Amino acid sequence: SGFRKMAFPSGKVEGCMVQVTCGTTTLNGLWLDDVVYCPRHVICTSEDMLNPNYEDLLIRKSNHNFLVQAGNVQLRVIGHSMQNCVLKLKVDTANPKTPKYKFVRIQPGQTFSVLACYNGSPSGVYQCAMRPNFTIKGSFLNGSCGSVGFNIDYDCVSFCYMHHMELPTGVHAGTDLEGNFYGPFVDRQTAQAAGTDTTITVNVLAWLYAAVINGDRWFLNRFTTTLNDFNLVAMKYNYEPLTQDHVDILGPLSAQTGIAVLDMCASLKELLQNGMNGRTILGSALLEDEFTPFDVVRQCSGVTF
Amino acid sequence: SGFRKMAFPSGKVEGCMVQVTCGTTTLNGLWLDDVVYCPRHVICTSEDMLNPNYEDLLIRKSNHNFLVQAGNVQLRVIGHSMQNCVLKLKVDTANPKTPKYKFVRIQPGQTFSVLACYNGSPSGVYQCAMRPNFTIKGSFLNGSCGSVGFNIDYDCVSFCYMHHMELPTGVHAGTDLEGNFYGPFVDRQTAQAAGTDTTITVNVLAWLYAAVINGDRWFLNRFTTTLNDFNLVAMKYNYEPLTQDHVDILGPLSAQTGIAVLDMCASLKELLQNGMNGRTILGSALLEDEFTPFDVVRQCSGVTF
């Protein structure tokens, strides 16, 4: 028992992290087979970021201008190209620690682990969600660009995020591993703010099921609701609509607890309208929305990798 | 910017996790050089746990009765001995992935990362604190015994916890890597409950400094306090006393923010007496006490390993 925010074991990703330097800019790259992936703004100075012409900056760089280091060992760059907002540096040595891997583009509301790195060295691991407004609420300092987000399924690492930018509100924006940003954001220091965010309803429900499984049951009320009536309330509290697909995804948690999804919705409705009255749920005094139904199942069933 | 509960990168520990089976009991072991460390109750059946005689159970086991598996590979056991509540299994192969390591016994209030494992395979990483009552609030299912807690300092893994027991209240108890329990607990299924816990004051203060560094400043009031007057209030709210050693540990955060420790204490005093009035601090609606001053510095300064 117990329920914690839990990241995937990071070892398979740690063995892929390298340092990439171009001129006076250093950030992190991801070394898979003989290719290093990194944010293309490694070729920008601080002044370049205000309005960068990436094609024009890149044509002035040679392979030799890219210093790639794996620990204390330089990897020789033998080719380079730009794909959307990422650079791909071909190196003459394939990473001996390359895991089985895939590149995936995740959906808003899904979660992943971030291995925060500086100078190619891992510093910490944490879990976060792709917000409905396509930002993530990470923990990133200068030098963290190129840190990646991932999920693991037994032996296979699915890379879904590469860190590029901090917005003026302190939240974070980045790309998939094909270099396409999540959301409308661009890798330029300009006026681009996150749109209004929303709460991930299906995840709040998943976490309420986790609470019941762990014995935190005080919020269960005696009522039910229709899906349409629940969604009228959820709207007022800036919760995203609950779809029948979401109801279906919650089926296994409903089966385990015996609580029908629409019955749990009625209990959430009351929490939204009345508040928690100073009580806690799974040690939290607010409703948590960064655990997916699959995260709850994993942690409550002990899935390993 | 941003502030997250963050674990250490787990790769160096992942490469040490093995499966240990004795009879019908399977749990996790830690493989360092040619020794596998695991909880001694791997030699107990379910009925044995009610009142185990570990010396008498162990004298009936041969080396061959211990099945140690590192992935799909059996490690031959060539010796065994009991040290306090851990077993040490000598194997005929030293772990090629042994990191630089130390065994440490941590103090209440200190934090560490847990690599939760099942059947010798890592499942997730999370951060937790040794509570003042010598329990931890983990996330552990059946089969997780032998999972370890650790801290990392660049290249050196300091192992501080091995998981043994879940208490009837759902919190967790275990040993250091010499097999001595934290707290008064024993590896027997008996009446042993956690004593009353307390809040780790120095950690709450550290987290309030983290909030200021991240720009969450609304709770700063205009007052100061004496250390003695602060501790009279802290006592009433079941906070542990703040010592001059704690004040000294907070010095660097005080310097970074310009907020004297006793001034931050005055702001915490007001939060304890008046509550948060429905506001949040670093996304939390309650006061968080599982970040040490060193954790705050690490995450706010980007320490790597």
Swiss-Prot record, chains A, B:
Inhibited by pyridone-containing alpha-ketoamides compounds 13a and 13b. In turn, alpha-ketoamide 13b (tert-butyl (1-((S)-1-(((S)-4-(benzylamino)-3,4-dioxo-1-((S)-2-oxopyrrolidin-3-yl)butan-2-yl)amino)-3-cyclopropyl-1-oxopropan-2-yl)-2-oxo-1,2-dihydropyridin-3-yl)carbamate) inhibits SARS-CoV-2 replication in human lung cells. Inhibited ex vivo by michael acceptor inhibitor N3. Inhibited ex vivo by compound 11a and 11b. It is found in: Host cytoplasm; Host Golgi apparatus; Host nucleus. It catalyses: TSAVLQ-|-SGFRK-NH2 and SGVTFQ-|-GKFKK the two peptides corresponding to the two self-cleavage sites of the SARS 3C-like proteinase are the two most reactive peptide substrates. The enzyme exhibits a strong preference for substrates containing Gln at P1 position and Leu at P2 position. It comes from the Viruses. Residues 1-305 are cytoplasmic. There is a cross-link at K5, K90 (Glycyl lysine isopeptide (Lys-Gly) (interchain with G-Cter in ubiquitin)). 3CL-PRO exists as monomer and homodimer. Only the homodimer shows catalytic activity. Interacts with host FBXO22; this interaction promotes the proteasomal degradation of nsp5. Cleaves the C-terminus of replicase polyprotein at 11 sites. Recognizes substrates containing the core sequence [ILMVF]-Q-|-[SGACN]. Cleaves and inactivates human TRMT1, preventing tRNA guanine(26)-dimethylation of tRNAs. May cleave human NLRP1 in lung epithelial cells, thereby activating the NLRP1 inflammasome pathway. May cleave human GSDMD, triggering alternative GSDME-mediated epithelial cell death upon activation of the NLRP1 inflammasome, which may enhance the release interleukins 1B, 6, 16 and 18. Also able to bind an ADP-ribose-1''-phosphate (ADRP). This is 3C-like proteinase nsp5. The gene is rep.
